[PDB]
Each structure stands twice: as C-alpha cells, then as structure tokens.
C-alpha cells in the first residue's frame, strides 16, 4: 500500500481571539435545552415585582442579543483616542 503526509506547524492560538468566542450555551445543545426548560419551570414561581437592577440590565441585554464576547468585540471598536474621549465624556 501507499500513504503520504505533509508536515507543517498549524498555529491555532491568536491575539484578541476572545472576541470571536461563543458561550457554552451556544455550543452545548444540552445546556441550551436545560436552560430553556428552566425558564418555563420558573415562569410561574417568579414574583415579577421583585426585580433587581442587575435583573433588568440582564433581561435587556438578552432582549438585544448581547453576550460577553460580542460586547468585548463591540466596545473595543474605534481607535484608542476615540475610546479615551468617550471615557472622558462619561
């Protein structure tokens, strides 16, 4: 029989790679199914008049389709001067 094989180093890591990461829930169907189920099971037990500020920020973040990595990617846009100016304007 016959066989061949090229030999080369395929460097997988990369600077700023964290900006392209996805969440476990997005890459793990079982975790995603579990969280969907838990959302249903708790819908009835939840007292909607007891929302903390973080609860409201979080729900709004989900409504707008935000995640940790997508936000990191987004907030690093622009050049250094633009971001420093936004910082001073905060």
């Amino acid at each position: 029989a016959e066989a061949s094989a090229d030999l080369r180093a395929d460097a997988m890591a990369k600077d700023r790679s964290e900006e392209e990461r996805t969440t476990e829930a997005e890459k793990n169907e079982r975790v995603q199914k579990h969280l969907k189920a838990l959302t249903s099971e708790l819908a009835n037990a939840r007292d909607e008049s007891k929302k903390t500020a973080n609860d409201m920020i979080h729900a709004e973040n989900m409504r707008l389709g935000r995640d940790k990595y997508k936000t990191l990617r987004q907030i690093r846009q622009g050049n250094t001067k633009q971001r420093i100016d936004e910082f001073e304007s905060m």
């Binding site: 476990e24 969280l35 973080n54 995640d67 940790k68 001067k81 910082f87």
Partner: protein
C-alpha cells in the same frame, strides 16, 4: 518558629516557619502539600495591620510584610488570576476543584451576578458533584437542607419555600445521572465563565471631570463600566494596545502602543488601589501573552 495557618477553599494547613521565610517559600510549601502544579493562578491573601485584604509578595520575607501580628498567622490560598478557558487550562483535579469552589462562592454570595435559570442549573451540577448520582435510598427528603444552593436574590424573587426548591433541584440532580463528579465541576465552570462579571476585578475610578465609574481588570484586558451597570462594559482596551502602565499617587496612566493616541488616565481613591491595579494588569498581561506565544 512562627505559627501559620493556610486555608484553601476546602482544606486547612498548619505550618511552622522560620523568621527568615519569604512569601515564595511559604507558597511553595502550600502548593507542595496540596499537590498543586498549576500555581500561576494562585496567591496567598491575608488581612494586614490596617485590616485590608492583601496579596503576600513572594519576593519579600513574610515577617517584613504588614501581617496582622497574631498567632497563628492566617492566610487564604485563592486564585488571583483566572484562565481564559477552563476546559483548556485547568488540567488537574485539585485546580478545577479550587476554582469551582471559589467561583461557586462568588455566585452564591452575589459577587458575580447570575440569572435565576442559570443559578438553578449551576446548583444542580454542584449537587451532582457533591453527592454523585441521585439515589432514592440515600437521598431522602431533606438531603439538600444544609446546602447553600442559590444566591439570596433568586430565593427572594420566587414564591417557593425551602422544600419546593429542594424538590425542583432534585429533579435536576436526577437529570445528570451518570455524570462523573469531575465532569459536573467542569460543566459548572464552563457555564460560569460566560457570566459577564466572572473573573473581573472591579475598581472604583474617576475620569478628569470627576465622573464615578468602574475599571474592570481581567484575563482579557481592561474595561470601563458605567457606575450602575457592572455587567456590560462601555469601553474596552485589549492587552496588545497597552505598552506601559504606571501611577503617581492617585493618578494612573496607561500608555498606548503608537504615539498618536493620548494617555488613558484615571484616578483611584487610594494609592493602595493603584498598586493592586498594577499588580493585576501585569499578571494578566503576562499570562495572556504566555498562552499565545510561550
């Protein structure tokens, strides 16, 4: 000899050290004793004379640091740095367990915000990890009665009592049937690392005009948050954009890699804070680089 007690998340160690002992020698006995090789993430914390939580410098003597003169000297062994990805970077059982217990502690105490659905899923993995497979013979009504399963905020938002919570959680425990204890720990950490506040060191800071804001230092860079929102940062600087960091009293200056962009400057309320920020930036920057180009 000086009496010392070092507490990890699940173990307590008692050491007797000579006055000559440096933080580095003490750290080596600890990691040695617990069988921990992934040491770079860890540190020893203590309460100083003034009452501040402080990381013991490794290059100096233990006695020459402002350790709260008492006996034994009390230190907490904790992760000072977090991996970017747990499945890749936390190879040992002891490492995973230590990160899991610490992270769980922050979730349970609401240091890290975690939404209710995720908090219950996490609680169920923590239960599989502690108890192993649900067993109707051993795990009778009340087996979870002494466990801190959820952050107080989640309990206060749902019209459920202790028993209802245990029953709901038991269903989920039962769901993970067959999952090894180590895999429940890792699954817990994989979900937890996606939380917005996970692994972030937050510092109260002001811009030139005196606005109150939060600086977040983590494994991936520097982030600026609005005072009221610590989940979603508004501005961010990746590590590769920073060339130098330094501080003069309350003022902290971050020099960008080029020349055309001005210095990123902010003001900390204490010099102690800036020293912590510097230590944290340096450590995270170094490990960040090390993962990419060893």
């Amino acid at each position: 000899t000086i009496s010392v007690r070092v507490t990890t998340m699940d173990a307590e160690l008692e050491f007797a050290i000579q006055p000559n002992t440096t933080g580095k020698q003490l750290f080596d006995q600890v990691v040695k004793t617990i069988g921990l090789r992934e040491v770079w993430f860890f540190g020893l914390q203590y309460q100083d004379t003034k009452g501040f939580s402080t990381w013991l410098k490794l290059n100096k003597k233990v006695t020459a640091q402002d350790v709260r003169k008492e006996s034994p000297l009390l230190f907490k062994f904790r992760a000072k740095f977090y991996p970017e990805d747990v499945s890749e970077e936390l190879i040992q059982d002891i490492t995973q367990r230590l990160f899991f217990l610490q992270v769980k502690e922050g979730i349970l105490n609401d240091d890290i915000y975690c939404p209710p659905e995720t908090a219950v899923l996490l609680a169920s993995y923590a239960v599989q990890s502690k108890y192993g497979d649900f067993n109707k013979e051993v795990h009778k009504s009340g087996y979870l009665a002494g466990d801190k399963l959820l952050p107080q905020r989640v309990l206060e938002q749902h019209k459920l009592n202790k028993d209802q919570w245990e029953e709901r959680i038991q269903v989920w425990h039962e769901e993970h049937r067959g999952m090894l204890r180590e895999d429940a720990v890792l699954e817990y950490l994989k979900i937890a690392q996606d939380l917005e506040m996970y692994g972030v060191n937050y510092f109260s800071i002001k811009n030139k005009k005196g606005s109150e804001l939060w600086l977040g230092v983590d494994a991936l860079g520097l982030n600026i948050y609005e005072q009221n929102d610590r989940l979603t940062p508004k501005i961010g600087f990746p590590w590769s954009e920073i060339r130098n960091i330094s501080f003069n009293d309350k003022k902290f200056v971050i020099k960008p890699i080029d020349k055309k962009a001005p210095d990123f400057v902010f003001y900390a309320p204490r010099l102690r804070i800036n020293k912590r920020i510097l230590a944290l930036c340096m450590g995270n920057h170094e490990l960040y680089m090390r993962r990419r180009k060893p």
